[PDB]
């Protein structure tokens, strides 16, 4: 149950992206559709096509995401350290313990 | 700006999944709060440390963090498919398609 959780969360980050890219990229289409017609394209792709995706207006983190998802997921994380990380689970157990004793 | 976003949000994704371990770990405490102590413990744990994470009451997904967080970000997506992801990418076009223009 946990890991379908974390499944469905991963990927609703990567949908979350997708949409943020693309929709930024959409609002400077040129008068010809040239970049709406590249994503209707997209939709209608054979998931085992990867030519089209070299040579492409589409976003490079739509065309990455397709022609390498693990790799993609990798240059994600690549900003983050172990400190970081270490960090987060510090200062989310101090939370937690707040809550879980009633103190806030 | 955009891999700021992709970062924190994957800290978001981060903090979310260790919420969700903990917090139902915790409900099943001991008398003697085993557990309750355990997360003060880490609370307060030097960032270099890992030798307390070999032998803990703390869930595995925590301790797998801390000792290597770049791995448990990868068995995070172990279960997702390149036809998952570029099926969840034709889908994500579709949708944006249909509100960009005004179709739905």
Redesign the interface.
């Known amino acids: 149950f ?2 379908d ?3 469905k ?3 609703r ?11 930024e990229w ?1 609002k400077t289409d040129d008068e010809s559709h040239t970049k ?1 017609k590249s ?2 394209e ?4 054979d ?1 085992n096509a990867t030519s089209f995706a070299e040579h492409s207006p589409l976003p490079d ?2 065309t990455r ?2 022609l390498d ?2 790799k993609a ?2 240059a ?2 690549k ?2 350290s ?13 939370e ?2 707040l809550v ?2 009633h103190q806030k």
């Open positions: 946990f890991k959780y974390q499944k969360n991963v990927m980050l990567l949908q979350d992206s997708l949409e943020k890219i693309i929709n959409l709406l994503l209707q997209l939709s209608e792709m998931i983190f739509v995401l397709w998802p693990h997921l990798d994600m994380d900003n983050i172990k400190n970081e990380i270490r960090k987060l689970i510090k200062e989310t157990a101090r937690i313990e879980f004793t």
